Design a protein around this ligand. Structure first.
Ligand SMILES: *[C@@H]1O[C@H](CO)[C@@H](O)[C@H](O)[C@H]1NC(C)=O
Ligand SMILES: *[C@@H]1O[C@H](CO)[C@@H](O)[C@H](O)[C@H]1NC(C)=O
Ligand SMILES: *[C@@H]1O[C@H](CO)[C@@H](O)[C@H](O)[C@H]1NC(C)=O
Ligand SMILES: *[C@@H]1O[C@H](CO)[C@@H](O)[C@H](O)[C@H]1NC(C)=O
Ligand SMILES: *[C@@H]1O[C@H](CO)[C@@H](O)[C@H](O)[C@H]1NC(C)=O
Ligand SMILES: *[C@@H]1O[C@H](CO)[C@@H](O)[C@H](O)[C@H]1NC(C)=O
Lengths: 604, 604, 604, 59
């Protein structure tokens, strides 16, 4: 786009709608649109140039909120940088933006201080920039798309999902279509809930005081002299906690910039104020990719959909988030009435595993372990076996076969042959529940849980407590269970249930959703081939504390190539008489009846 | 248009009438007009150039409303950015602009604070820019039009509607014809209804105080000194809540800009102040598209009409919106006298489903489920079966058939054939109503509802309450029904009725409109192939709370190609002796008698 | 990139996401991306140019935190220079940044003064710069990658791990993908915990005082006059310890720079504010390196993974870090409930070694030593032998063989032949534990430990205490054990247990994790061929004191070439029919069936 | 001594470079031990050695 800047001496449009966007991480991950500047299309005013596949409608509407916008609960989270994306009725609208760099701070300021958040935003959005419907894709994005297509062609349903998760990590969860270019001047003013409970009838005065304080802090730079200083403003400042005036656009903010010099500061600076986009799985349509065939593009879109879904469900964590309730879970984003649900107590029953291995019995015996009570895969008397996960495990083993041909024993040289013998071993995890009123003595007491990735919240380290035996559940899931009841009673915590991605725990009252009852705090334990297993515990002190970080894709190490690579040179549909033949090129699909019939007669 | 800027050193007209416009989202979605600058046609003053297919009549009328414009109820919603579009007698004039970024804030400020909105607008509209009647269409818009035409040609009545909904998402619901270029300076000053009830005879003084406060806040930048400061102004500021001075045009606003420097700021900035346009389905006329045939263009216009209708009815939600009434529904946009209607109570009867599948019985048994009371598709004694939806469901299944030809067992290679076996399974949902005075013990109690898309407002999460069995209605509609009466009485809520897009519930008193009686709050449940099904519940606390977000098109995942693609090379009319023959090109329709008769003799 | 600076007179983007990043050392080690400037791609504003394989999304969001951010405990460590990397759920998220130049100072200020840290940060991040997914690698990084590949090809599994550790030392542990270019103005204000315990209800005032003090120190440069000076500010300054206003970006900070001149100072200066990247072992994918084969790249990635793991576990040290507890370990980064664990006391049992040498018995007898009590490899009565390490040791011996051919005894000249006879000697270390209640008289008392690398914390020098015999454990591990009980009782310290990388000590209660019980402080002793052995001691005064420095890779001297170099010209997979043939070039892998079958028939 | 690796010097052979690195290592060691002097460095103790750098509990 440098040729257009040379021909037209004016800065390029700063924020562009072309490119992927992540709802959780709250950042634009990658570029999904090519956005060529072959023709120097500019904004209707001589200020910014725009790519050819993007049109802009200049709104240039500047608002001056004289009073603050109060957010009582943080479940809504009317976000600043993206209000039209964190609000859509997506797969999960509640956790649409609950992992942002802004919402994390807002949450740690709202629950740890019992203080609602009030913002005084001055958003002078300049351009509502939008993508042209007939826009192409960027070379990197379409290259990753074609790579996922070729990997779905080679019957690698695990490697294709892994590459889709990598694409989401590199291109977000939503393709931005609309974006409100402009600037913002927000003061995320958190104020105690008791200040609103004492001024519920005078909330208008609270909002007015917040707004005038924002205004006089922006312009004056002097804290001893402000405008409209009253007693209620002093009480507001006294009940005020963690004030921060954040200018999302324009020249970087300081308490000295008069709002005239701030609004005039928007001449080159134009940041996304209200970006709105559709999910990327919906963006990849059969007409969007001309060379790639229709049904294959639809299968790839379904793969991207299920990968975005695995991203969402693994990222979000269900649990009550009511500040006053005792079973309040701080880490949870999406809240159900678990804290309000009747509290109970369950006795854990133990876990065992089965080995079904090809060869080399040393590797599956590591993941295989028996019960603590009985010592065998049989369920303890009085409990019911519940299935958790039925998938295969494999790790690569590098073997090199060397045969040396040595003449006169001085020309001796070693030449080898690298062989990678990936061994697959089926593994299944089972855990039982007290379906009957069995004695609590037999009831194993859950003491904690840890693997090499997460940290045991009870011990604050990747370690097994004293007196407990580590039980390897799948590969590295080390559950710590008490060999006896009393000596491990003070340290341990009542169990909540083990539920996985395919099958849930029966503890919720015969339908049983993938959740733990009795107001127990749920946490993730292990991810395995795009499937999660979760542990739930009593809502104690260790359930809260720190905020859970954002889990990022991919959710598995690169799956090894167990299946052989396939070349689906011919693609067919049973519904319609539509086919697609692969040319000698890598990705060049063309319609032809003779070639199709010939290659079909050859393959079958 | 850069050649005209080089030849004539002056900025281009900022806002243009060419382009689509969405009534609900309140933004210009896409460009429907080409707007070529082949001839450098300018405004009659040397300030802005205009496209060749657009003429402008300069009004340059500047108004200074010294007093505010009060809006008692928000049902009218005289919008700021578009007053001539949100007022037309369209398909739904009440919800014409009820999903705007402005109206949402106005509503949350009007009902949550019981405060009417008053605006002091200074709209100096400069140019009443209008489109030439003999104007062509943009390449992207006409390309999407031709795509919808070709898809209606291939007998894909579902994919064509999906592409029409996508076009509406990309080109809005109204093609703008007139637009009032200019700037605005509005103060959306919300003031309590009690302040107007106490000053009903002195509303003129309230409006004067609002206007003078707007004026002295715009110019002075000093809050301690204003002009015409009286006691009534102080009472107005005391009863004032969420003031915001929003300048829709010109240089971005700040409390320091004297209105002289604001009005002089309009030299390059020209935003749409009063945009007026006709719906896009009416814009696509037989004479608008020369190559595309007449009756096919009319069928495409009817498709766009029904798609805009599906957009509207799915977006809008009917329910009483009277602040004082107990059955007030906050989310509802269009209001009938439901809250004033006589309150009742109905006992829910249960839902069952039928499977009619081609092959592979595993997929339809997921959507098929029996009654909770009886356990069979038979209606419970004393109830009447009511039909909800009769449409087919299908999901794609990717199957690849591989036959390997391996010589010496070392040249072994796998070559497959991608086959997509879309399986269609007819599904029908039925729910019964207590036509007679049946016991309430048998009457199933509605506990809530959720799918993978929406969120259960009772549980605030996508989850089934404890003690309830999830009932899959169509694909993912998981209704939670109580197995017993008492234990689930405190959590559940009296039912309101299930009504779908094709058939409504008989609960409204034998004609039965698609609505729920007794002042019950209505909400959307599932969209399926452009058809909506709705659930209605007692107007409790959970019905209000947050405002319902804007539902966006398309209202279904891309429908799979079940029907075979067709090439209607010949098009005929039974009324008139008019035909249209397809040339070897993609879209090139030409009149010819010999070609028509020959190809007709060949096809039939 | 100088051609783009000549064509476009503007500074290059200062911080770039391309390049490796070390989590522990908290610095960008090396460059992992080539970042060519073949096309002069610039930022969307005329301020900075960017490499072709890097795109930037300008956020330009400037925040002004009016109140401080309090960190009660230093276990979370929300870092300033990298908040999105020290938070990810990596192999070890607790020690993700516990070896930074910032965290070391924060720790020595937090525990030695019992003072929590509060920061008032002004981070005006300008560009969220990100790497293109289809980006190549830098010549040096890909050269080191190819070197590790060739060394894994030559069956040097130790030299390959050594080169991987060297690469991590030269390219960090994480490949940066996202980076928030900008500036920061942070005041790491440490304040006593008693000041927060006395103002727990008034923590908002403490944060406000910290923020206003930051603001008035930044701008005024005069310490006698500040704004908003109250009594609580004076109490804050009285309880204040080690204040430091650190500007991470922009023009270097001084108390005179008004924040206007600081924010305006960001025109060329752009430092990483929030850098986010994935681990480098995950960055090296089969598609990232085209020439290098797939399974070999996967094996190299596993080698880099295990080398990063050895870096992490050797760097981190587990031990309780609770300030109030008596068993507080200052050096420990990751904390378990060891201090809270029941305190015990164990009697050390002694160490012996075995020699299994090829030839030249002088070298293994140095590492071999018998027990002090018994004087033989037999375990003392009442103890249980525990294995520590089973690996081979070797050191190079240079021998030159000279035979002189001298004519007339005056032409006499010496010509030799350098021969390097690396001698490998197997060595095993065993140490016993009092499995039974043996007398304490026989129980050897652990007096200390030292080698040539670390320093004995009891003697503060590499020396053996008087009256103790040095016991060489592996090569240089000189454990000092008491020959008697009483005379060495005052100097010595109760033992905690010897646990190594492969096998742990059985002192933790038959599973025994690699840890020491009873709240004993753990320290590293010796690293040997990528394996660590650790000694644990009673949590006394000498366990704290100074902070442990950062252990840096490689964790072994260059392993001698014991195994012969191999040329795996052919690489094969047993799962898929995929192979890779080496061309006469160094690293040029190409697919061919005839060449593969021929060379396979030749090698086997 | 660690910087001089077999790959750092291409012309010079591997084992000879390793022997030279061991020579540089032992020379740096002779530099260190000859430079440093062990002795107690506690100001209050009577046997305080001022010249000593590294301190053991000799005093
Ligand atoms: C394709 O992958 C699936 C899933 O692992 C497997 O069941 C099937 O046998 C594979 N087919 C071929 C031809 O590799
Ligand atoms: C909040 O304001 C009330 C009003 O007087 C005051 O009594 C109270 O002390 C304030 N709280 C704080 C924490 O300053
Ligand atoms: C066209 O579509 C309709 C609606 O699905 C269907 O009834 C009809 O059989 C189809 N005709 C052809 C020729 O595909
Ligand atoms: C509104 O104005 C009346 C007039 O005196 C006053 O009594 C009342 O307190 C005001 N309400 C608020 C909320 O300030
Ligand atoms: C390769 O190295 C391994 C590990 O030291 C050794 O066991 C094996 O014998 C070596 N093979 C060759 C051919 O050098
Ligand atoms: C901390 O502040 C309190 C409040 O008066 C004061 O009593 C105390 O002396 C202060 N501590 C220090 C170390 O200045």
């Amino acid at each position: 786009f440098q040729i257009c800047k040379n021909a037209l001496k004016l800065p390029v449009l700063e924020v562009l709608p072309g490119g992927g966007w992540d709802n959780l991480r709250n950042v634009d991950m990658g570029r999904v649109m090519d956005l060529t500047y072959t023709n120097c299309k500019t904004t209707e005013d001589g200020q910014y140039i725009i790519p050819d596949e993007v049109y802009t409608i200049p709104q240039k509407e500047s608002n001056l909120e004289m009073n603050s916008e109060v957010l009582e609960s943080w479940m809504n989270y009317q976000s600043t940088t993206s209000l039209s994306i964190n609000t859509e009725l997506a797969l999960f609208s509640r956790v649409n933006g609950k992992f942002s760099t802004e919402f994390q701070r807002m949450k740690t300021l709202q629950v740890k201080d019992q203080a609602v958040t009030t913002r005084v935003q001055v958003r002078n959005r300049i351009y509502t920039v939008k993508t042209t419907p007939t826009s192409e894709l960027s070379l990197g994005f379409t290259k990753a798309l074609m790579d996922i297509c070729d990997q779905l062609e080679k019957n690698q349903t695990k490697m294709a999902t892994y590459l889709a998760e990598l694409l989401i990590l590199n291109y977000g969860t939503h393709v931005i279509t609309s974006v409100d270019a402009g600037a913002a001047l927000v003061q995320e003013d958190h104020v105690r809930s008791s200040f609103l409970l004492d001024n519920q009838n005078s909330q208008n005065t609270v909002t007015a005081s917040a707004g005038i304080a924002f205004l006089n802090i922006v312009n004056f730079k002097v804290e001893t002299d402000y405008i409209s200083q009253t007693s209620l403003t002093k009480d507001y400042l006294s009940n005020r906690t963690n004030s921060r005036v954040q200018s999302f656009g324009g020249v970087p903010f300081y308490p000295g910039i008069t709002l005239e010099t701030w609004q005039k500061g928007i001449t080159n600076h134009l940041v996304a104020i209200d970006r709105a986009g559709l999910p990327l799985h919906f963006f990849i349509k059969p007409d969007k990719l001309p060379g790639l065939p229709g049904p294959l593009v639809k299968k790839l879109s379904k793969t991207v959909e299920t990968a975005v879904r695995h991203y969402y469900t693994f990222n979000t964590h269900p649990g009550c988030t009511n500040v006053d309730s005792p079973n309040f879970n701080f880490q949870a984003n999406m809240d159900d009435d678990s804290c309000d649900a009747k509290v109970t107590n369950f006795t854990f029953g133990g876990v065992y595993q089965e080995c079904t291995e090809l060869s080399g019995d040393v590797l599956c015996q590591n993941l295989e372990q028996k019960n603590l009570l009985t010592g065998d895969f049989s369920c303890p008397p009085g409990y019911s076996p519940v299935h958790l996960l039925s998938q295969t495990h494999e790790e690569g083993y590098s073997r090199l076969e060397c045969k040396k041909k040595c003449t006169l024993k001085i020309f001796c040289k070693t030449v080898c042959e690298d062989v990678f013998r990936v061994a697959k071993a089926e593994f299944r995890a089972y855990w039982c529940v007290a379906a009957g009123q069995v004695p609590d003595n037999s009831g194993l007491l859950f003491g904690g849980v840890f693997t090499d990735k997460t940290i045991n919240p009870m011990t604050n380290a990747q370690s097994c407590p004293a007196g407990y035996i580590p039980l390897n559940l799948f590969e590295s899931l080390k559950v710590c269970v008490s060999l006896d009841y009393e000596l491990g009673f003070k340290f341990s915590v009542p169990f909540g249930g083990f539920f996985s991605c395919i099958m849930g725990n029966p503890l919720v009252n015969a339908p049983s959703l993938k959740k733990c009852p009795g107001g127990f705090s749920q946490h993730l334990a292990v991810i395995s081939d795009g499937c999660q297993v979760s542990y739930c515990v009593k809502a104690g002190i260790f359930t809260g504390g720190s905020l859970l970080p954002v889990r990022l894709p991919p959710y598995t190490k690169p799956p090894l190539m167990s299946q052989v690579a396939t070349n689906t040179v011919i693609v067919t549909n049973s519904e319609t008489a539509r086919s697609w033949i692969k040319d000698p090129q890598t990705n060049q699909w063309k319609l032809g009846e003779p070639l199709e019939l010939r290659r079909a007669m050859t393959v079958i």
